[model samples]
Target: MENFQKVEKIGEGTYGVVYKARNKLTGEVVALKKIRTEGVPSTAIREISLLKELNHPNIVKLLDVIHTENKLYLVFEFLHQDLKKFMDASALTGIPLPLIKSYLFQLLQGLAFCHSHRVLHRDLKPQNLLINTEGAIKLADFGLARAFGVPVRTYTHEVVTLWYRAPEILLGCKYYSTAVDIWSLGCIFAEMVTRRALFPGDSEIDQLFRIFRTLGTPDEVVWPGVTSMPDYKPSFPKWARQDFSKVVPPLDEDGRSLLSQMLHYDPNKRISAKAALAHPFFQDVTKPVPHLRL
Candidate 1:
């Protein structure tokens, strides 16, 4: 039973159109997200069921699901803006330090919750995060997420956005897991500081070049399995790792320390979201209140 009446289009996502809608009977405002797929893609099915089972403050709430003749609609709780839009408005004026800490802390809490449940949010970009006036941010768009259980198997390399993708994924590694999300977290953290992407590359090779040029070319010593990657090259120009403190001056030592761990060359070495929450970078930030409301 569809109870919503479309008010207006609000946002366009990777595979859907989100609208500001109202429940005709109850007069409740919600985002009527439409996913138009031929015969309904498995991704849509996964997202519907996954979101139904997920209940967290930092994760977008899926209130209901409606199936039409050709389109499937996801009814989600309305939020004011996406993280990218929020960042855009604050880019020039700059996002306050405490705000960024709070946002990232909430993000990590959501991510850790997903990881604990064995769900990997394969796609995590600023656009995929929802924010409200209360300064609360929640993870959205679980279209690319999939559960990873014991005996980790090879997954698709094409997951995260190119700018926020991890190096292992860029190098054709298929066994990537939770670490991939952490890599994106590092990029998002840096972007929150500089108000720009850390590595904006046009192609896979160029992305690697951007990462290598900044973080130094990986080799046997630093990254033991580097040479074995499908896309690894022996002729990669050697470049020394640059200091994070200099790259993102706004980030303090503790912030840089956590950033370094999040952007580790080896996926296995990247900081877990749970462990990252305990990092000193967020020592002064307050623990997020469960199910924070406006």
Candidate 2:
């Protein structure tokens, strides 16, 4: 526990206090997570177990874990900032179009890997994405992540952050798929490009309507059984056609096209993370650098 020097507290996470630290022996900078697990149950154990097996360059690496009499300590590579911080700053600096494309491409790549492995990153938000010195983006905070491959699992719908929540989830659909993550990626991509959230609704109904306003209401023809969902209700202004140009005016043609595919009203029709990577928006990105390194 005394082997590393804690530099500064980075932020408070879902389950712990994140800190920037340096190893005494190696002098390598790292983020130390101190979790209060005194009364917590097996959830923390499950997170640790899953993280031990999940390894990818875009996923935050779990270096080590230390169990003490009172708390659990997790070690990770230090990141200079997070997507939210970067976005806030970029609003002032005006983020370059290519940089936004690069970040979106990397985000999709990371998500594709997780979906391929049958993992659900339930809580994906810009704040959970970290940026290293080279501007490489990494997905972090897997405490809410879960592995679910079976169909019709009665899992909690209280997973994703409100801004990134999928339309199906918002409509109270129980059966979800990797499409949920794709929806989130869509929101994240939009946020990155605009430097603000695409849908900022005050409530569940408002959120669903906000989406419907831009993508049109989901009908049985476009989305089978969408009307049969437990929480299905009629929306106001009753299903007008979407005007993509007004919704995402800041995006380029390619970016707007990808966003439309991603923000599909029907989860089944939404673009997959892997397919999103192949979209023309990323055609000019560097091959070797999956994300623009800092």
Candidate 3:
């Protein structure tokens, strides 16, 4: 409190209002998230615990936590902007392929770090991902995050936004894992390419059908044991699989191929972050030039 000064109001979240602030002595900047005086919630506890354990360049840094008479404030390395606003505000219908590749790579790296730490960012959407001017991305907003296989194993199906929620999750799977996060990543990747949501379904039913309309409906053959899920929908109509290029006009063949793998019906078959990072789509990302413009 003594060292930081609030510059302006950021927004309100499940916790409370967030603000852009600066440190006095060190002249550093940060986003101060306030946890209202209603007492510390379980979500805050889980977020703090997991954040302390996940240390990575692509993940947002939790610098300090402040406790006061009326509220608690979380000090984070400032990233004033996020992916949602950035993409929405841009005039172009889609981002350049190179930027899309870099951003997606960073996203995979950050999620890989979280998965390595056994943390699942259940609520993964563009709004929860922060981006800096240097083209670096940092995973943010962990109100729905949880450590996998903890004391409690079961999770909720009401996680993730409707447009981004995985099919399996929509069908009600209380026990899930990192694959769910991977599914959301696939959705985010598509949104990145199109500059809009691929499945902007109105409700859970609409959401599942919207997904089915794109990838086609799944069954015992495609998704083994899917019928056994609590919310399986047998009455749903199936549609033919659409071409990926139509959805992502600028994405290359390799990019579309990788996206298909990520959004696969079976969670086990969906590509993991580690495998995604090694995929051929990023082969040239870190490769060196011959130095002569041959």
lDDT of each: 0.79, 0.76, 0.76
Question: What digit string (tens of lDDT, one per residue) describes model 2 on residues 1-294?
Answer: 899899998877655578999999999999998866355455656667677677888888888877776567889877777888778776776567777777778778888888888777766788889876665788886534442222221123223247788988877777678888888878888887767798877777777878777677778888887888888875445667667887766788999999989988787789999888889988898523223234
lDDT of 3 by residue, 1-294 (tens): 878899998766544567898899999878987765465565665567557566788888878766666457788888757888877766374566677788889889988888887777776788878877667877886423442212211223223357888887789898887888888888988888877798898888989888888887888888899989999867778787787677766788899989999999999999999999999999876422111110
Clashing pairs for model 1 are: none
lDDT of 3 at 137: 77
Candidate 3 Cα deviation (angstroms), residue 251: 1.6
Full candidate order by lDDT, most accurate first:
1, 3, 2
Task: Give the clash count for model 2.
Answer: 5
Mind giving the per-residue lDDT tens digits that candidate 1 earns over 1-294? Answer: 367778898866555567899998989998887765476665556656766788789998888777778567888888877878777878687787888889899999999998898777777889888887666889886533442121211122223347887899888787888888899988998999998888998777888999998999998888888899988889888899996677787788998999999998988888999999999988899634223232
On the 0 to 100 scale, the lDDT of residue 283 in model 3 is 81
Query: Which residue window of length 10 is worst by lDDT in model 3?
Result: 147-156
* TM-score, every prediction: 0.86, 0.84, 0.85
Off by over 4 Å in 3: 1-3, 41-47, 67-70, 147-160, 286-294
Judging by TM-score against the true structure, name the best candidate.
1
Could you say which candidate leads in lDDT?
A: 1
Instruction: Kindly state the number of residue pairs that clash in model 1.
Output: 0
Whichever of 1 and 2 has more lDDT, that candidate is: 1
Give lDDT: candidate 3, residue 240. 76
